[PDB]
Design a protein around this motif. Sequence first.
Motif, PDB file in Angstrom:
ATOM      1  N   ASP A 172      32.670  59.373  69.768  1.00 37.11           N
ATOM      2  CA  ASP A 172      32.805  60.827  69.713  1.00 37.11           C
ATOM      3  C   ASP A 172      32.028  61.533  70.819  1.00 37.11           C
ATOM      4  O   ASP A 172      31.486  62.618  70.612  1.00 37.11           O
ATOM      5  CB  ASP A 172      32.373  61.362  68.350  1.00 37.11           C
ATOM      6  N   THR A 177      41.701  63.100  53.599  1.00 42.55           N
ATOM      7  CA  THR A 177      41.258  62.325  54.738  1.00 42.55           C
ATOM      8  C   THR A 177      42.402  61.472  55.248  1.00 42.55           C
ATOM      9  O   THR A 177      43.135  60.868  54.469  1.00 42.55           O
ATOM     10  CB  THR A 177      40.091  61.434  54.345  1.00 42.55           C
ATOM     11  OG1 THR A 177      39.022  62.249  53.859  1.00 42.55           O
ATOM     12  CG2 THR A 177      39.619  60.639  55.529  1.00 42.55           C
ATOM     13  N   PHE A 178      42.556  61.432  56.557  1.00 40.45           N
ATOM     14  CA  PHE A 178      43.580  60.638  57.198  1.00 40.45           C
ATOM     15  C   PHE A 178      42.940  59.783  58.268  1.00 40.45           C
ATOM     16  O   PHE A 178      41.911  60.146  58.838  1.00 40.45           O
ATOM     17  CB  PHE A 178      44.636  61.505  57.831  1.00 40.45           C
ATOM     18  CG  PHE A 178      45.825  61.725  56.974  1.00 40.45           C
ATOM     19  CD1 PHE A 178      45.690  62.256  55.715  1.00 40.45           C
ATOM     20  CD2 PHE A 178      47.080  61.418  57.435  1.00 40.45           C
ATOM     21  CE1 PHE A 178      46.784  62.465  54.935  1.00 40.45           C
ATOM     22  CE2 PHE A 178      48.169  61.626  56.661  1.00 40.45           C
ATOM     23  CZ  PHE A 178      48.024  62.147  55.410  1.00 40.45           C
ATOM     24  N   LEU A 179      43.558  58.646  58.546  1.00 38.89           N
ATOM     25  CA  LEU A 179      43.135  57.802  59.648  1.00 38.89           C
ATOM     26  C   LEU A 179      44.288  57.712  60.631  1.00 38.89           C
ATOM     27  O   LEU A 179      45.366  57.229  60.286  1.00 38.89           O
ATOM     28  CB  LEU A 179      42.718  56.422  59.156  1.00 38.89           C
ATOM     29  CG  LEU A 179      42.216  55.498  60.250  1.00 38.89           C
ATOM     30  CD1 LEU A 179      40.744  55.725  60.437  1.00 38.89           C
ATOM     31  CD2 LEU A 179      42.488  54.075  59.881  1.00 38.89           C
ATOM     32  N   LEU A 180      44.045  58.160  61.852  1.00 38.66           N
ATOM     33  CA  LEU A 180      45.069  58.464  62.835  1.00 38.66           C
ATOM     34  C   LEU A 180      44.949  57.484  63.982  1.00 38.66           C
ATOM     35  O   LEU A 180      43.846  57.215  64.451  1.00 38.66           O
ATOM     36  CB  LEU A 180      44.868  59.880  63.339  1.00 38.66           C
ATOM     37  CG  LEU A 180      45.057  60.942  62.269  1.00 38.66           C
ATOM     38  CD1 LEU A 180      44.666  62.284  62.779  1.00 38.66           C
ATOM     39  CD2 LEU A 180      46.489  60.945  61.872  1.00 38.66           C
ATOM     40  N   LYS A 181      46.064  56.957  64.455  1.00 36.24           N
ATOM     41  CA  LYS A 181      46.038  55.921  65.475  1.00 36.24           C
ATOM     42  C   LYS A 181      46.598  56.476  66.772  1.00 36.24           C
ATOM     43  O   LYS A 181      47.796  56.753  66.864  1.00 36.24           O
ATOM     44  CB  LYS A 181      46.831  54.706  65.028  1.00 36.24           C
ATOM     45  CG  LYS A 181      47.112  53.748  66.135  1.00 36.24           C
ATOM     46  CD  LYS A 181      47.968  52.631  65.646  1.00 36.24           C
ATOM     47  CE  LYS A 181      47.727  51.396  66.468  1.00 36.24           C
ATOM     48  NZ  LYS A 181      48.345  50.201  65.844  1.00 36.24           N
ATOM     49  N   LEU A 198      41.333  54.513  66.825  1.00 34.10           N
ATOM     50  CA  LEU A 198      41.607  54.993  65.484  1.00 34.10           C
ATOM     51  C   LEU A 198      40.550  56.021  65.143  1.00 34.10           C
ATOM     52  O   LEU A 198      39.377  55.837  65.460  1.00 34.10           O
ATOM     53  CB  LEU A 198      41.598  53.869  64.468  1.00 34.10           C
ATOM     54  CG  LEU A 198      42.338  52.613  64.905  1.00 34.10           C
ATOM     55  CD1 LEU A 198      42.413  51.615  63.780  1.00 34.10           C
ATOM     56  CD2 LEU A 198      43.725  52.964  65.350  1.00 34.10           C
ATOM     57  N   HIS A 199      40.966  57.113  64.525  1.00 31.54           N
ATOM     58  CA  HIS A 199      40.062  58.205  64.228  1.00 31.54           C
ATOM     59  C   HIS A 199      40.227  58.621  62.779  1.00 31.54           C
ATOM     60  O   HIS A 199      41.253  58.366  62.160  1.00 31.54           O
ATOM     61  CB  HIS A 199      40.313  59.389  65.141  1.00 31.54           C
ATOM     62  CG  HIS A 199      39.251  60.427  65.062  1.00 31.54           C
ATOM     63  ND1 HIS A 199      39.525  61.755  64.837  1.00 31.54           N
ATOM     64  CD2 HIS A 199      37.906  60.329  65.159  1.00 31.54           C
ATOM     65  CE1 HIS A 199      38.394  62.435  64.809  1.00 31.54           C
ATOM     66  NE2 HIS A 199      37.397  61.592  65.002  1.00 31.54           N
ATOM     67  N   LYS A 233      26.390  57.697  66.898  1.00 31.45           N
ATOM     68  CA  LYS A 233      27.033  58.643  66.009  1.00 31.45           C
ATOM     69  C   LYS A 233      26.021  59.551  65.348  1.00 31.45           C
ATOM     70  O   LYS A 233      26.346  60.684  64.996  1.00 31.45           O
ATOM     71  CB  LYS A 233      27.835  57.903  64.963  1.00 31.45           C
ATOM     72  CG  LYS A 233      29.018  57.197  65.527  1.00 31.45           C
ATOM     73  CD  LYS A 233      30.183  58.130  65.569  1.00 31.45           C
ATOM     74  CE  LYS A 233      30.452  58.710  64.199  1.00 31.45           C
ATOM     75  NZ  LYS A 233      31.395  59.851  64.278  1.00 31.45           N
ATOM     76  N   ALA A 261      49.665  56.751  61.170  1.00 28.40           N
ATOM     77  CA  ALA A 261      48.619  57.333  60.354  1.00 28.40           C
ATOM     78  C   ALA A 261      48.561  56.606  59.025  1.00 28.40           C
ATOM     79  O   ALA A 261      49.511  55.940  58.615  1.00 28.40           O
ATOM     80  CB  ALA A 261      48.843  58.822  60.140  1.00 28.40           C
ATOM     81  N   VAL A 262      47.414  56.729  58.371  1.00 30.17           N
ATOM     82  CA  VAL A 262      47.148  56.100  57.087  1.00 30.17           C
ATOM     83  C   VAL A 262      46.506  57.126  56.175  1.00 30.17           C
ATOM     84  O   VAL A 262      45.512  57.758  56.547  1.00 30.17           O
ATOM     85  CB  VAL A 262      46.240  54.868  57.228  1.00 30.17           C
ATOM     86  CG1 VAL A 262      45.907  54.341  55.886  1.00 30.17           C
ATOM     87  CG2 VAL A 262      46.955  53.797  57.987  1.00 30.17           C
TER      88      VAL A 262
END
Lengths: 23, 20, 165, 27, 48, 48, 91
Positions: free
Chosen positions: G42, D12-16, A22-23, F3, D26-27
């Motif tokens: 990252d 802002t998005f949270l991508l799976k 998840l990013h 990070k 996505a969220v």
Amino acid sequence: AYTNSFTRGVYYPDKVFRSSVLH
Amino acid sequence: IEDLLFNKVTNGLTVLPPLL
Amino acid sequence: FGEVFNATRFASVYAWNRKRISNCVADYSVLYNSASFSTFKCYGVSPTKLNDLCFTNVYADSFVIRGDEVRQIAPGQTGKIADYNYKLPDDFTGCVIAWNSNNLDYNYLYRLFRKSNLKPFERDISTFPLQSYGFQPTNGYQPYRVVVLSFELLHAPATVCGPKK
Amino acid sequence: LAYYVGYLQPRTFLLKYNENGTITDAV
Amino acid sequence: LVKQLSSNFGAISSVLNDILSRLDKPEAEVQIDRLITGRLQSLQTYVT
Amino acid sequence: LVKQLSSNFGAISSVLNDILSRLDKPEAEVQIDRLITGRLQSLQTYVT
Amino acid sequence: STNLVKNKCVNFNFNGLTGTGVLTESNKKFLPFQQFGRDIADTTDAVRDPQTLEILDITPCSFGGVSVITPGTNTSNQVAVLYQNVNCTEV
């Protein structure tokens, strides 16, 4: 006129491959 | 029971192995 | 110092002269106050404080360039001069002096082509890489005489003292 | 030339990403 | 702790008097500030 | 901790190589100083 | 663009990214526009060969601590040496 973009319009924001994350 | 328990738990940095 | 700042001739910047000063009660107040110097820029020390420091060695590196290029006599500058011609260390401690020389000053040659930047305080003599200065009585292009007064802080028996009674 | 025009905002998005590298949610 | 008094932390000298004897106010302030930052951080680490 | 390697801490970039390869040593030194201070503080936080 | 060499710790540099490590035959599946691969933190993990559409794992070429096992000097001057987390070859 107006309709509803439910869960549309997500695009690969950059070139990077990622997986199972998840990013 | 020790097997149940062991299953149910899931840059310059290095991790050292425990002595035991 | 009267044998340096009023020198009968200054070397070319590629063959820059280096006169070593040692065992002298060096009064710098006269140099600092005198209004003959276009720039009198002390770097590792403050110019007014020099009267109170003992140095092991003083080094007057003397030469001449166009003042539009004088700005390159400073630690960490880019220029055919500061790179291929005459380099001051990144931790230079000392004072740089430049003044106008039209009143007196193509004997002044300077390198343009070289396989690399030269190490600080190195001097190079070789040969067509060089090119002359267009210094005329009728010309930033005008000539300026530069004295680089470097100090040695390496604590040894101090040798150049100040007028501190 | 029946088309849709929606606008983009700085969100802002949270991508799976699944195993193969695809954004499957996505969220 | 004591050894950390010999580190420049970026200044021109670890010795405070040298900075004071070799520089005027507007520049000695900069160097002394670098020293102060370093030494303050050394004290904080010691105390923690 | 890892990070934190991806932060500028005020420098022009979080990539040490790029800071190096874009700027002349007098200025690269300042940017790198900012990076070093930030990363060193990240370590101290981690260790505490 | 020089040649590309694998399984040795090298200074790789692709289109705009530099690094050091071991380039190995990946098996991940990049999307036909995807160039790089990032890790959970990252950090780079794979690359796309800009002259050949094949993907290379990147690994940090080995490092570790070097520890010196010793009986007290006043017993001997003989010492053993442990190279942590490395394989007995790279040493």
